[PDB]
Ligand binder design. Sequence first.
Ligand SMILES: Nc1ncnc2c1ncn2[C@@H]1O[C@H](COP(=O)(O)OP(=O)(O)O)[C@@H](O)[C@H]1O
Ligand SMILES: Nc1ncnc2c1ncn2[C@@H]1O[C@H](COP(=O)(O)OP(=O)(O)O)[C@@H](O)[C@H]1O
Ligand SMILES: Nc1ncnc2c1ncn2[C@@H]1O[C@H](COP(=O)(O)OP(=O)(O)O)[C@@H](O)[C@H]1O
Ligand SMILES: Nc1ncnc2c1ncn2[C@@H]1O[C@H](COP(=O)(O)OP(=O)(O)O)[C@@H](O)[C@H]1O
Ligand code: BEF
Ligand code: BEF
Ligand code: BEF
Ligand code: BEF
Ligand SMILES: [Mg+2]
Ligand SMILES: [Mg+2]
Ligand SMILES: [Mg+2]
Lengths: 79, 544, 461
Amino acid sequence: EFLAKMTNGFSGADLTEICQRACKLAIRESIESEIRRERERQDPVPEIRRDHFEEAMRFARRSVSDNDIRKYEMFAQTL
Amino acid sequence: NEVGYDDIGGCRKQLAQIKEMVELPLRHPALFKAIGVKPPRGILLYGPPGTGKTLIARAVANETGAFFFLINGPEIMSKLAGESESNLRKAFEEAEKNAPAIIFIDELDAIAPKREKTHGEVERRIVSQLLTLMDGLKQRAHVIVMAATNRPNSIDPALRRFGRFDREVDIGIPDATGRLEILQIHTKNMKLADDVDLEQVANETHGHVGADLAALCSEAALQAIRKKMDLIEVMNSLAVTMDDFRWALSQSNPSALRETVVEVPQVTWEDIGGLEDVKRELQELVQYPVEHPDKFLKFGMTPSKGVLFYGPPGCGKTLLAKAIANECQANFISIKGPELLTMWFGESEANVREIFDKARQAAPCVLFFDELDSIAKARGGDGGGAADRVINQILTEMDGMSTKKNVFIIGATNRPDIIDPAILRPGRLDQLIYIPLPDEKSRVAILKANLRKSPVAKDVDLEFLAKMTNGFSGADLTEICQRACKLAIRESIESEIRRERERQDPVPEIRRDHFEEAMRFARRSVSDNDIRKYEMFAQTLQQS
Amino acid sequence: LNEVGYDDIGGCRKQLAQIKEMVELPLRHPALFKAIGVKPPRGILLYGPPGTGKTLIARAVANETGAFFFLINGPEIMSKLAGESESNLRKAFEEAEKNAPAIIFIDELDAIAPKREKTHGEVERRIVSQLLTLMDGLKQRAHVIVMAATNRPNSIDPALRRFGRFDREVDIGIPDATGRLEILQIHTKNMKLADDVDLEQVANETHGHVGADLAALCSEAALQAIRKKMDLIEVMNSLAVTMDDFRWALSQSNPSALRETVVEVPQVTWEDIGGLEDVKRELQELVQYPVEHPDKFLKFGMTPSKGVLFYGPPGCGKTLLAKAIANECQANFISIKGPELLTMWFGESEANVREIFDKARQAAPCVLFFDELDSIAKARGGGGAADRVINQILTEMDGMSTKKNVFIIGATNRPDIIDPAILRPGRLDQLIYIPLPDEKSRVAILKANLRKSPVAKDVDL
Ligand SMILES: Nc1ncnc2c1ncn2[C@@H]1O[C@H](COP(=O)(O)OP(=O)(O)O)[C@@H](O)[C@H]1O
Ligand SMILES: Nc1ncnc2c1ncn2[C@@H]1O[C@H](COP(=O)(O)OP(=O)(O)O)[C@@H](O)[C@H]1O
Ligand SMILES: Nc1ncnc2c1ncn2[C@@H]1O[C@H](COP(=O)(O)OP(=O)(O)O)[C@@H](O)[C@H]1O
Ligand SMILES: Nc1ncnc2c1ncn2[C@@H]1O[C@H](COP(=O)(O)OP(=O)(O)O)[C@@H](O)[C@H]1O
Ligand code: BEF
Ligand code: BEF
Ligand code: BEF
Ligand code: BEF
Ligand SMILES: [Mg+2]
Ligand SMILES: [Mg+2]
Ligand SMILES: [Mg+2]
């Protein structure tokens, strides 16, 4: 709910991209932990984390701009 | 050298289907008689070229106890009028009379051109005769007809409907396990070595189709033989090792991509200075999807696939592309901007379709759509009304009614503002990577990498050069180094010619005077206004 | 005595070794292959630019290999009757396999294998399907090797190009200096030429030739030598081709590839240009060092620069320098005016640009001269044909290519219009400025322009 409230101009594609980026960050952390564990030898992160979501929010972006979306409103107004 | 079901691998479901179909009715029709419904009596094998269709056909023919009849597609018709139909009738009647036999037609797309586009009356008559013979009155009893074709689309729907060719077994490309099994099958008959990693070879091999695995094995054997060229007690010790396996693997490319293979210069990640973030992101993006699919499946969402590079000209977009091509574990396809456009109507869309189909077939592949500016304008006095159609084709192919197994799209451009907003939408080109002009550390690294293999005197001050040059770019630094090298070579040539003339290694390393002279007239490549435009475009998106 | 042999092939060692390793060993002694276990390749395809020697290699292999040989001209299997082409092809293959472990050679198979998909007819489709099924299928091969030869292999079916039918596609590329020297030595084995000729030098000057043009040069030199004795035409035993004859033949001859782009050029030497000594020297170094001393560049481990741009007020010596280079430069020259490569058809302009650049790099080392660069490469901002062509030029000039050697010389007098992308270092790095003459430059140009003319001594320059 907080993420949705903060994001205003985003769209479903942007939200899906944020989720995918969070997943990629989680996988990167997991694989780094596993490789370090193996190296020291010779599921640390079972769930996506608030820090991962924070990074995704940090470097997410908006798909379309208000100036661009105005065109659809104008077309609807025309009819 | 008999070939049987033990000589085929990488196709379990399809092989099981064909096996049960060809055995159950033959081994005992009592069960099917008790059930009441007769089993199917027709199958069509379709797939990309060189997947194993003919191998399956010949294995079934040589292993089944029932009589087998073979009919090459372009073999029935003869000079005499009304002879192809007679030949077909004679073949079918002889086969059915002989025994509960099996008919195999190879490349029937040459004899069934859809019955609509064909012009010659012979083709229409033969296809109609085949249809009538397959489906008529009291036609067949205890006979199964096979098929094998590369283009199932160009077949008659009347022939493809149930009762003539009802089931279409898909013999597709294998996976890692399939490639491992195929390699085991091919290498079993030969004494390879005491130290081989077939699992590693299968992992490395990505877009091959079994026939290419056989080609790789043959190339490895040839390299092993040539390793004894000087020697040629040898045949006994002949073997193939990891060395020639790796050599053949490096030289091997999938048969599908033989059409669009172009040599590219060799470059390695150490050749690029700075851009640590971009390098790490590209490496992770191209590695994780094809390295740890289990984690992606467990988390439950497919990862990003597209990436776009936008920045001032002379930052290293093409250099990163070359590095990816040289040091990627996935097949690389290079396509220029307007290479897919032709004057004919719709042939540009046909080329786009076939290139994306090739990429999907050879997946995992990385597509480098260089000059997206040229490829796709924003939208639309149209110039032939084809740019819009091509752009729509690209959009729908990239994100439409498809699974999108594994195909990464990379775009390099320097005018992002003339790109259609749809392309930038997440899910197509979600990753917008910005490559700024190098800073002090980046310039130092770029110069050091550029001068990696060259005789350079110690008096040089790379830090001093980096501090002196502020707005320069990688291209500018490369040009400065090239100027220095040319001045050194000119000095060497003049000294050598003077010394030879006087008679009838003066300079072993480029020197500080050479660098000073070269830098005397260095010029910037990208203007303040252009860099400001790029930064503004970056800001309008970051602020979003 | 005139039969071509393996020694008759020159300028191709790696390709010849690749051909032999799979043509001779299986027929020489297959014991090693049997011991290894895996069968060797049984199909090869020769592809390269026209007139490289692929047909000569095929002829030598046919005339040297002991095993039975069979040949099939491509556009010759077809017959007027219906289905007769497949009958002929099947009979040829059957008799070839029955006779012995023979060799089948198909010449220009691209005329009988039209990709099976883009073709709209039916006879060609049936023929290609027959060929596919005949080479690959049940009862595949009785130890029979197939060969092919096409100048352009792209227009061939991918199924044909797949392993098992045509697996090894040896590329017979353009020769080098040593290859040209070997070709000249091979061709000049039946001439009482002289005791003073140095074929190495002639090979050095000969740059873009592809062997067939070397043969043409030798024939032209022989014709010149025989014509030189027209007055006397004791003569039969005195015939001989001299270094002067070779010089004349070399001066007259031009590479076959650049034949389509041959244009007359006025003869102007360096002395005809007044002043601009620094520009002349810099350009000479730029165009000479990469081709003259590549060893030093390799030692220094850096590729040389390949771009220069001429910009200045009209009437200063830009096109004059271009003419001087086209006349007195060792490398091949290609002159293209600005809008020559533009056509109304959709994409044909890009096709023309790609064709020209491919031809230039293929015939390298050559210097490509662009005139009205501001006209060809407009800034960025009728269907965007200008944008598409500029993008094509940029990408094919600095894309995923080896960029062997093509020097681009730019001439224009409106530099501001040209977009910054072209002027980036690495494409047209050198920005040479040609200003209006000073007093000394004016005196020098006057002297050069009055070099050959009757002028009274009273004239003061
Ligand atoms: N599943 C497989 N297992 C083992 N070898 C295979 C397999 N698929 C293909 N091959 C090898 O590659 C070749 C390609 O299959 P092939 O029967 O020629 O198919 P096609 O009829 O499409 O040309 C086979 O002849 C065989 O040598
Ligand atoms: N980071 C870098 N490190 C080393 N050389 C670089 C770097 N960036 C650019 N260069 C040099 O500048 C050239 C131009 O960069 P490139 O990737 O070709 O960009 P573009 O495709 O926009 O022309 C490169 O080919 C390379 O020679
Ligand atoms: N590598 C070569 N060595 C010697 N002579 C050559 C070579 N390449 C070409 N030639 C000469 O030039 C001719 C043209 O080459 P050729 O084999 O006919 O090629 P193509 O059939 O593609 O035109 C040859 O017949 C031969 O006389
Ligand atoms: N420095 C010069 N030396 C000799 N002739 C010159 C010189 N500058 C100009 N000319 C003469 O004037 C003409 C115009 O110069 P040119 O290089 O052709 O410029 P442009 O191509 O812009 O018209 C030359 O073709 C030549 O006839
Ligand atoms: F290449 Be096969 F005939 F599918
Ligand atoms: F010069 Be690059 F292609 F931006
Ligand atoms: F001109 Be050749 F036949 F390649
Ligand atoms: F007058 Be020139 F062609 F600049
Ligand atoms: Mg087949
Ligand atoms: Mg580029
Ligand atoms: Mg020929």
